[PDB]
Amino acid sequence: KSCCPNTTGRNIYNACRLTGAPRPTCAKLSGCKIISGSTCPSDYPK
């Protein structure tokens, strides 16, 4: 899944996405990152 440091980062990432902006751009606007793994590491749990 998608892997964000904080709730606020998940929120911005999500707001970027909802306003139809592409995933990688939103990922770096937020500072999230993306894995295959169902759960993310302890530092990017959201």
From Swiss-Prot:
Subcellular location: Secreted
Source species, domain of life: Eukaryota
Residue pairs linked by disulfide bridges in the UniProt entry: C3-C40, C4-C32, C16-C26
Function description: Thionins are small plant proteins which are toxic to animal cells. They seem to exert their toxic effect at the level of the cell membrane. Their precise function is not known.
Family: Belongs to the plant thionin (TC 1.C.44) family.
Protein name: Viscotoxin-A3
Species this protein is from: Viscum album (European mistletoe)
Gene of this entry: THI2.1
